[PDB]
Design a protein around this motif. Structure first.
Motif, PDB file in Angstrom:
ATOM      1  N   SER A 154      -5.735  -3.938   1.650  1.00 49.98           N
ATOM      2  CA  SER A 154      -6.379  -3.495   0.300  1.00 49.98           C
ATOM      3  C   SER A 154      -7.437  -2.367   0.831  1.00 49.98           C
ATOM      4  N   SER A 155      -7.956  -1.580  -0.840  1.00 50.28           N
ATOM      5  CA  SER A 155      -8.927  -1.510  -0.783  1.00 50.28           C
ATOM      6  C   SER A 155     -10.262  -0.673  -0.061  1.00 50.28           C
ATOM      7  N   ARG A 159     -11.240   1.211   3.306  1.00 47.50           N
ATOM      8  CA  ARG A 159     -13.064   1.587   3.505  1.00 47.50           C
ATOM      9  C   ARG A 159     -13.688   0.933   4.574  1.00 47.50           C
ATOM     10  N   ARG A 188      -1.416   5.402   2.553  1.00 43.65           N
ATOM     11  CA  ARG A 188      -0.679   5.462   0.900  1.00 43.65           C
ATOM     12  C   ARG A 188      -2.042   6.432  -0.120  1.00 43.65           C
ATOM     13  N   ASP A 189      -1.520   6.484  -1.006  1.00 45.96           N
ATOM     14  CA  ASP A 189      -2.495   7.513  -1.445  1.00 45.96           C
ATOM     15  C   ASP A 189      -4.111   7.073  -1.467  1.00 45.96           C
ATOM     16  N   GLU A 190      -3.718   5.951  -1.519  1.00 44.38           N
ATOM     17  CA  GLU A 190      -5.270   5.381  -1.656  1.00 44.38           C
ATOM     18  C   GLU A 190      -6.144   5.205   0.179  1.00 44.38           C
ATOM     19  N   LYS A 193      -7.376   8.676  -0.512  1.00 41.65           N
ATOM     20  CA  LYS A 193      -8.647   9.173  -1.323  1.00 41.65           C
ATOM     21  C   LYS A 193     -10.254   8.332  -0.589  1.00 41.65           C
ATOM     22  N   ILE A 194      -9.887   7.598  -0.170  1.00 41.24           N
ATOM     23  CA  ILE A 194     -10.932   6.268   0.544  1.00 41.24           C
ATOM     24  C   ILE A 194     -11.562   7.986   1.727  1.00 41.24           C
TER      25      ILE A 194
END
Length: 272
Positions: A154-155, A159, A188-190, A193-194
């Protein structure tokens, strides 16, 4: 024609245009690379005594590109610039302490740096070995906290993995973390980006030693030399195979004309 005119007549032959950073369709984010132009004064001073033009004595001024790595949208980096005759050495470090001192000696012997991607839990449990790496003037990056498959996380968990690891590294080493690498290459892209939200680029690789399978050292060495190319990023771990092969590997990379260094040095726009 005197020496000065001979150097002038050869200037355009040795000029190189700067190359811009871009996101390659296949290799994704790629740094720019400086161009060069002949430095007339330094080149003349280098050839004055022997009174003859010799391209080996040319010196250059560098020319910066207009688009830089940091201008790009968030995207993983697999390679340095494909015209830059340099290779980046990287070591993913979450175990194998018994080979760490010897690997650091080999790097010192060749006066080369590598980027050590450290697992946060490994740092917490091995603070003296994390300090050993930075006291050897090697640079450290983020390899997550517990080595999960970050593509399926998960995001929130991504993080937390990144933040916990940076807090642990920065306390053990007092260095800023510039680079992150996803465990097992899974992302993945997320994730990218994080990592960018923590001011980190995401560093993949182009040459995998597959050293965790304990290959014979000469097999590891031949694999690397077969696959290596300008701008290559090599993935290793602290293993017997890497430790037994690294000394000859660096010698052979330099004999091939490659500069050898860490990720920060590899991605630098300065010419080799």
């Amino acid at each position: 024609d005197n020496l000065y005119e001979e150097i002038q007549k050869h200037a355009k032959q040795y000029e190189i245009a700067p190359q811009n950073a871009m996101i390659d369709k296949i290799w994704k984010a790629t740094p720019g690379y400086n161009g060069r132009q002949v430095d007339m004064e330094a080149s003349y001073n280098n050839m004055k005594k022997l009174k003859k033009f010799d391209q080996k004595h040319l010196e250059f001024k560098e020319v910066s590109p207009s688009v830089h790595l940091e201008d790009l949208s968030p995207a993983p980096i697999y390679r340095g610039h494909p015209n830059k005759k340099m290779v980046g050495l990287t070591i993913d470090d979450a175990w194998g302490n018994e080979y760490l001192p010897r690997i650091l000696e080999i790097l010192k012997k060749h006066d080369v740096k590598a980027t050590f991607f450290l697992e946060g839990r490994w740092v917490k449990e091995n603070l003296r070995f994390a300090k050993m790496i930075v006291d050897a003037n090697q640079e450290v990056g983020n390899h997550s906290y517990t080595h999960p498959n970050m593509k399926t996380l998960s995001s929130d968990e991504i993080r937390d993995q990144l933040q916990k690891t940076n807090r642990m590294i920065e306390a053990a080493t007092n260095q800023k973390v510039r680079w992150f690498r996803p465990p097992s290459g899974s992302f993945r892209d997320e994730v990218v980006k994080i990592a960018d939200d923590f001011q980190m680029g995401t560093i993949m690789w182009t040459v995998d030693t597959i050293d965790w399978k304990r290959p014979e050292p000469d097999v590891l060495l031949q694999r690397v030399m077969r696959k290596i190319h300008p701008g290559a990023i090599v993935l290793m771990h602290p293993t017997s195979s890497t430790t037994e092969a690294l000394d000859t590997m660096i010698t052979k990379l330099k004999e091939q004309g490659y500069k050898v260094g860490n990720i920060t040095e590899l991605l630098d726009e300065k010419r080799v």
